[PDB]
Amino acid sequence: MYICGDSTECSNLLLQYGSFCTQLNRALTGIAVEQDKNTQEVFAQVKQIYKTPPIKDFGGFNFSQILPDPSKPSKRSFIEDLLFNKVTLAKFNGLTVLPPLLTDEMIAQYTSALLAGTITSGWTFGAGAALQIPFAMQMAYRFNGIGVTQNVLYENQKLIANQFNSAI
Amino acid sequence: KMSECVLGQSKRVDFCGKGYHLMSFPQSAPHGVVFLHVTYVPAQEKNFTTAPAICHDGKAHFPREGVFVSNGTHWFVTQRNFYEPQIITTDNTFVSGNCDVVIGIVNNTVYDPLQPELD
Amino acid sequence: KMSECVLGQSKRVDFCGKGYHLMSFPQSAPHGVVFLHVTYVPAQEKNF
Amino acid sequence: IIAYTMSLGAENSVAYSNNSIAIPTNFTISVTTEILPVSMTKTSVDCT
Numbered sequence: 001m002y003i004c005g006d007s008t009e010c011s012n013l014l015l016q017y018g019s020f021c022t023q024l025n026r027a028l029t030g031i032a033v034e035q036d037k038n039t040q041e042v043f044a045q046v047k048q049i050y051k052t053p054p055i056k057d058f059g060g061f062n063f064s065q066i067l068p069d070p071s072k073p074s075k076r077s078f079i080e081d082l083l084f085n086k087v088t089l090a091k092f093n094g095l096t097v098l099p100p101l102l103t104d105e106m107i108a109q110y111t112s113a114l115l116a117g118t119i120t121s122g123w124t125f126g127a128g129a130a131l132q133i134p135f136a137m138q139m140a141y142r143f144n145g146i147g148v149t150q151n152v153l154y155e156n157q158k159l160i161a162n163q164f165n166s167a168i
Numbered sequence: 169k170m171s172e173c174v175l176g177q178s179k180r181v182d183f184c185g186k187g188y189h190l191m192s193f194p195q196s197a198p199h200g201v202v203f204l205h206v207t208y209v210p211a212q213e214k215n216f217t218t219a220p221a222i223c224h225d226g227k228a229h230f231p232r233e234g235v236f237v238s239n240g241t242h243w244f245v246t247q248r249n250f251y252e253p254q255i256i257t258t259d260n261t262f263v264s265g266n267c268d269v270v271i272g273i274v275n276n277t278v279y280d281p282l283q284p285e286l287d
Numbered sequence: 288k289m290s291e292c293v294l295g296q297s298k299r300v301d302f303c304g305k306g307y308h309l310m311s312f313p314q315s316a317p318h319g320v321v322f323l324h325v326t327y328v329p330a331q332e333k334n335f
Numbered sequence: 336i337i338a339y340t341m342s343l344g345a346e347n348s349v350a351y352s353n354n355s356i357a358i359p360t361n362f363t364i365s366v367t368t369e370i371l372p373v374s375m376t377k378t379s380v381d382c383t
């Protein structure tokens with residue numbers, strides 16, 4: 001359609017050239033399939049969506065910006081919703097744009113699951129069935145990995161929580 | 169991937185297989201390399217009530233490597249990945265500061281294993 | 288990075304953000320992923 | 336042939352609480368295979 005246009009006469013000459021017409025379409029389709037695969041690899045890291053715990057207590061950590069808002073339409077978190085405004089994309093003549101295998105809405109759910117998974121189960125969810133852990137306790141493990149002892153987090157959790165909240 | 173997986177063990181989560189990667193073996197394939205990944209995944213989770221610090225004399229201990237885990241009758245310390253219960257003692261703990269500051273704490277005994285050997 | 292940083296703490300230095308790495312929270316943007324990295328940095332020092 | 340809406344997974348919320356923890360009592364060793372291509376056929380075409 002692009003090269004020859006609507007006219008039949010133009011089409012005949014294109015046939016003479018070969019499988020160039022056919023080959024170019026195949027390459028684009030391969031590219032189109034790849035996009036879905038990339039998104040699939042990046043976000044389908046979790047077997048099962050994990051609903052966020054009803055209790056919002058997280059040992060003084062405020063996660064309101066990061067987590068999805070039920071009142072708001074499209075289940076996009078405040079940080080996420082702000083981001084969409086920042087980047088804005090804004091058929092015609094033989095060129096067609098195909099919609100993503102994963103709808104923006106679906107992508108939102110995947111992100112929430114990881115967020116929900118990380119807070120509720122630590123790193124346990126990555127390697128198997130998610131294991132419930134106290135958030136303060138999870139943070140304690142994190143300090144140990146980086147060489148600051150767990151007691152240190154517990155001694156001034158409040159100071160740490162405020163900095164984290166302020167940072168977010 | 170082969171160099172990290174076949175020689176040595178990779179600490180990176182999910183880089184080689186799914187879950188903790190104990191070891192890996194590689195099998196030759198036509199125009200490719202196939203890697204078989206051996207990984208450790210924890211199958212069963214028994215619910216246990218837990219607390220971060222135990223206050224014995226107004227000083228609160230913390231585990232050297234184990235999340236404090238209590239069935240509800242007594243408090244024992246086990247490795248976070250497999251359930252091994254060890255009676256809490258000075259050997260498995262260290263005391264820093266006073267047990268007023270920590271948000272979550274449970275009063276508990278200490279064994280003091282030097283005393284029964286002495287007496 | 289998602290697998291490496293969101294699921295578990297990453298030992299590799301500068302793999303996630305700057306400084307010591309604690310955890311990361313994934314985010315979604317059009318045709319992209321925005322990562323929030325939580326890192327531990329030492330604010331004050333003294334000679335010894 | 337039926338067209339569904341593509342549900343992602345089972346929706347389960349892990350029980351959460353400040354004083355509640357879960358620790359595994361048994362472990363399973365499994366083998367997973369990942370396949371990566373290392374080479375392709377080498378074709379030299381004389382241009383003449």
Ligand SMILES: *[C@@H]1O[C@H](CO)[C@@H](O[C@@H]2O[C@H](CO)[C@@H](O)[C@H](O)[C@H]2NC(C)=O)[C@H](O)[C@H]1NC(C)=O
Nearest residue numbers: 056057058060061062063064065066078165166
């Ligand atoms: C966690 O998130 C924000 C920041 O503290 C708080 O949410 C605010 O809630 C009040 C009404 O209760 C609104 O006026 C604000 O709009 C919210 N913040 C913003 C920035 O919009 C929330 O109070 C904090 N924590 C909790 C536990 O609710």
Ligand SMILES: *[C@@H]1O[C@H](CO)[C@@H](O[C@@H]2O[C@H](CO)[C@@H](O)[C@H](O)[C@H]2NC(C)=O)[C@H](O)[C@H]1NC(C)=O
Nearest residue numbers: 210211212214250251252359360361362363364
């Ligand atoms: C750990 O799980 C393994 C695997 O399911 C259990 O091993 C089995 O135990 C049963 C009952 O003793 C045997 O009849 C089977 O032959 C064993 N193998 C399998 C694959 O089932 C093991 O008993 C469990 N361990 C603990 C400590 O409960």
Ligand SMILES: *[C@@H]1O[C@H](CO)[C@@H](O)[C@H](O)[C@H]1NC(C)=O
Nearest residue numbers: 132213214215216349350357
């Ligand atoms: C652990 O938590 C649940 C909470 O519903 C508890 O009743 C049961 O002992 C265990 N089951 C789980 C997490 O499924």
Ligand SMILES: *[C@@H]1O[C@H](CO)[C@@H](O)[C@H](O)[C@H]1NC(C)=O
Nearest residue numbers: 238239240241242243244253
């Ligand atoms: C820990 O709890 C289990 C289950 O109630 C019980 O069988 C066991 O006896 C408890 N530990 C001790 C030392 O009694």
Ligand SMILES: *[C@@H]1O[C@H](CO)[C@@H](O)[C@H](O)[C@H]1NC(C)=O
Nearest residue numbers: 055057271272273352353354
């Ligand atoms: C745990 O959270 C509950 C929320 O109902 C609260 O009543 C309780 O005091 C908290 N306990 C600790 C140790 O944080």
Ligand SMILES: *[C@@H]1O[C@H](CO)[C@@H](O)[C@H](O)[C@H]1NC(C)=O
Nearest residue numbers: 223224225226273274275276
């Ligand atoms: C633990 O002991 C202290 C006094 O040392 C007491 O104030 C406290 O209420 C005890 N608490 C529990 C919850 O057993």
Ligand SMILES: *[C@@H]1O[C@H](CO)[C@@H](O)[C@H](O)[C@H]1NC(C)=O
Nearest residue numbers: 328329330331332333334335
């Ligand atoms: C350690 O030594 C310097 C010497 O110039 C001194 O001024 C300061 O107390 C300490 N330095 C730093 C770099 O914090």
